[PDB]
Amino acid sequence: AQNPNCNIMIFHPTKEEFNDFDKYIAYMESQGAHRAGLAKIIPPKEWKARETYDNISEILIATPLQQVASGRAGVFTQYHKKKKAMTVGEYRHLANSKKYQTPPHQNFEDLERKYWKNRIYNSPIYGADISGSLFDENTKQWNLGHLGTIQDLLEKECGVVIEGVNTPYLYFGMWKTTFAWHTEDMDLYSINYLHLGEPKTWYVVPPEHGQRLERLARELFPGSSRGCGAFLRHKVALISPTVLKENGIPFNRITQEAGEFMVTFPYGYHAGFNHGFNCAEAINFATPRWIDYGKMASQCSCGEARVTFSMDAFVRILQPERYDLWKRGQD
Ligand SMILES: O=C(O)CNC(=O)C(=O)O
Ligand SMILES: [Mg+2]
Ligand code: NI
Ligand SMILES: [Zn+2]
């Protein structure tokens, strides 16, 4: 078995290997990358996502989210308070202000220490989940707006034609902005490209050990667990590396820098934080190996998780027994 310790792997494809996206994902899996839940892909030196980032300041963040924490430093939840619209240029200036800017630090490890110590005492503002793309239309390799769609994959594998579309999302971050512990909708893959700015630190649990994380989460968030049998679908709970180590949960960590791709694999729980002002782009995707994970994915039916239009068909076709209850949660 390849990669039996479930380490995060880093790949350096050549420009020739960067042509065929599906083939390279299958190659990474042949080397055991998926066992970690997360992989890093450094593009060939010849590639670029677009020519410059000089003209992005007029993009609108219609609903910036202030991430307010409750709990203790290593075990907390966050809720998202909606703020007034602002442009990317206005958000960048806010991120660089004395109130929100990254503090002085020695290295990534020192910054990680400061994040875990101090996150809860601040409420950073996240420009998350903005439909759109920063890939130039002429970028032909690993262009996250030109991938094969999940609906076309289901159709190719299973023969059933379904409604829905699959488009990317932009994330404009600042120091301490946080992504809570989650897997993707329907336990899909995700791919994330860091276009510009300061790094993003990730934590991940191997897919084969995901239920260990879920059992800890039910212990640490006992009211939430009573409310919903899949409450990590709410995307609000944080647990620190120190707490994970104290409870014997297998995980790994890695820092993504500008110009790098990360791939999350089906049922790989992940969480993390931004180091400073940055912009990422991400989208979900599927492969043939996903189908069995999609059929087994947990679902939130309590009403909190509320998701996209396109998840309807995935539930309806892959999980017809769950469909009626899940749909009530959506309505
Ligand atoms: O970058 C973020 O805030 C969150 N990203 C992801 O969870 C992802 O790409 O799967
Ligand atoms: Mg602009
Ligand atoms: Ni994700
Ligand atoms: Zn729920």
Nearest-10 Cα torsion for 13, 251, 73, 196? 0
What number does the ligand 1 atom closest to the CA of 126 have? 3
Please provide the size of the chain in residues.
331
User: Residue 27, class by beta-carbon neighbours within 10 Å (0-12 exposed, 13-18 middle, 19+ buried)?
Assistant: middle
- For residue 311, how many C-alpha atoms fall within 13 Å in the half-sphere facing its CB? 21
Q: Is 182 annotated as a binding residue?
A: yes
Instruction: Pinpoint the alpha helices (H) of the chain.
Output: 21-30, 88-95, 108-118, 150-158, 210-220, 222-227, 241-246, 290-296, 311-318, 320-330
DSSP characters over 150-178:
HHHHHHHHH----------EEEEE-TT-E
Name the one residue in this structure whose structure tokens are 């020192």.
Answer: 110
Domain spans of the chain, in order of start:
1-331
User: If you compute the radius of gyration of the chain from its CA atoms, what whole number of angstroms results?
Assistant: 19
- For residue 313, how many C-alpha atoms fall within 13 Å in the half-sphere facing its CB? 16
Centroid of ligand 4 to alpha carbon of 299 (angstroms): 8
In angstroms, the CA 63 to CA 40 distance is: 30
Amino acid at 16: E
In angstroms, the CA 73 to CA 200 distance is: 19
In angstroms, the CA 276 to CA 319 distance is: 40
What number does the ligand 1 atom closest to the CA of 173 have? 3
Name the one residue in this structure whose structure tokens are 């790094």.
Answer: 199
Centroid of ligand 1 to alpha carbon of 221 (angstroms): 22
In angstroms, the CA 220 to CA 233 distance is: 16
Ligand 1 pocket test, candidate residues 78, 144, 171, most atoms within 8 A of CB: 171
36's tokens: 């970690």
Nearest protein Cα to ligand 1, atom 4 = 179
Centroid of ligand 2 to alpha carbon of 85 (angstroms): 15
16's tokens: 């020739």
Name residue 197's beta-bridge partners: 278
**Is the separation of the CB atoms in 83 and 126 below 8 Å?**
no
User: Residue 121, class by beta-carbon neighbours within 10 Å (0-12 exposed, 13-18 middle, 19+ buried)?
Assistant: exposed
Query: What is the number of the ligand closest to the CA of 61?
Result: 2
What number does the ligand 1 atom closest to the CA of 200 have? 1
Second-level CATH architecture of 1-331? Sandwich (2.60)
Q: Which residues lie closer than 8 Å to 108 by C-beta, 6 or more apart?
A: 199, 201, 255, 275
DSSP characters over 261-308:
EEEEPTT-EEEEEESSSEEEEEEEE--TTHHHHHHH-----SSSS---
Give, as one character, the DSSP assignment of residue 120: G
Query: Coil, strand, or helix at residue 47?
Result: coil
Centroid of ligand 1 to alpha carbon of 305 (angstroms): 16
Query: What is the number of the ligand closest to the CA of 278?
Result: 1
* H/E run at residue 66: strand 65-72
In angstroms, the CA 218 to CA 97 distance is: 38
